[PDB]
Amino acid sequence: GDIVSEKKPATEVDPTHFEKRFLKRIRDLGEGHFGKVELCRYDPEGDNTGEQVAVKSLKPHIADLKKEIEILRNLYHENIVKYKGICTEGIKLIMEFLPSGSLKEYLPKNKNKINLKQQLKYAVQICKGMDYLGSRQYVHRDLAARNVLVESEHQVKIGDFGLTKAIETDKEYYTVKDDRDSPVFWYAPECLMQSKFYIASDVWSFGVTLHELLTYCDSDSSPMALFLKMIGPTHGQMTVTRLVNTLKEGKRLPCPPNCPDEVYQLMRKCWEFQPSNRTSFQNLIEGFEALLK
Numbered sequence: 001g002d003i004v005s006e007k008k009p010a011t012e013v014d015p016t017h018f019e020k021r022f023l024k025r026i027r028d029l030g031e032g033h034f035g036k037v038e039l040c041r042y043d044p045e046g047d048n049t050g051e052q053v054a055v056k057s058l059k060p061h062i063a064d065l066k067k068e069i070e071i072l073r074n075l076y077h078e079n080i081v082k083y084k085g086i087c088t089e090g091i092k093l094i095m096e097f098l099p100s101g102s103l104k105e106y107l108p109k110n111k112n113k114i115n116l117k118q119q120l121k122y123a124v125q126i127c128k129g130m131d132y133l134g135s136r137q138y139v140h141r142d143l144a145a146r147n148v149l150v151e152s153e154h155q156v157k158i159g160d161f162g163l164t165k166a167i168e169t170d171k172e173y174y175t176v177k178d179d180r181d182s183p184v185f186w187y188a189p190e191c192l193m194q195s196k197f198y199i200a201s202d203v204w205s206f207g208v209t210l211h212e213l214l215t216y217c218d219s220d221s222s223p224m225a226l227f228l229k230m231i232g233p234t235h236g237q238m239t240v241t242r243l244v245n246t247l248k249e250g251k252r253l254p255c256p257p258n259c260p261d262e263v264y265q266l267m268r269k270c271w272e273f274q275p276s277n278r279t280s281f282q283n284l285i286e287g288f289e290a291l292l293k
């Protein structure tokens, strides 16, 4: 008889599957030693009217990216960047694009627009996103101004989850093995000394991110710049031990210029040497809110 073929079933569009052929690169948003985030237009009509998206890929680590995708896909919060979908065969993560970029890009350019009150409002939003993440039993491990995105003058979102780990139920912390490219000038002593990551360790990192926000991410006042002044900039592989010693001695980043002492004191509560002595994200929120009203 006739050639037998397969009955074509009723195909449905998945709005979270982005086809490689319509995903068109515009420029880079960031990169590291294993990957990049690129600005693309998803342009199925081919007339440059498609939606702009942020696309996270790997350089020619897959498993970690798949885990990152699965974490972000299931986070829903107004201060966490929106998952849009994936592009696959290898995999790419597709996210909403925030044209203002990170606080590192935005703050140096917008000092006149963004006063202390707005900085404190950003600080609360960062804290709300982080408290949501902790409520889902995650530790972020990479909270820094470069990973905080600006949705508008009035709203920020946590914009990267590449190091985020689940803390096991009934456990207080996650222990990391892969630690080469750690952001050590953002890390709490327990992270540095033992590679143990608590929710309290994210509070510590928040305090450093707050210091960045308050300095408008000026490079000459960055956590790295200031610590290297405190400890010495030419110690190579002794850097972390000298960082740890400085922190053991009770030395901390200084009060930013024009930062009220009452804001600096909330910051210091993030930097208690022992995790259990640190403030919580909820208490930070309360504290900033008291300063705002």
Ligand SMILES: CC(C)(C)OC(=O)N[C@@H]1CC[C@@H](n2cnc3cnc4[nH]ccc4c32)C1
Binding pocket: 029, 030, 031, 032, 035, 036, 037, 054, 081, 095, 096, 097, 098, 099, 101, 102, 146, 147, 149, 159, 160, 162
């Ligand atoms: C280092 C690595 C390539 C792994 O990741 C990043 O560079 N991540 C940065 C965090 C925010 C990213 N970014 C910068 N401008 C952005 C604008 N919109 C964005 N949506 C999702 C991420 C994102 C943006 C880049």
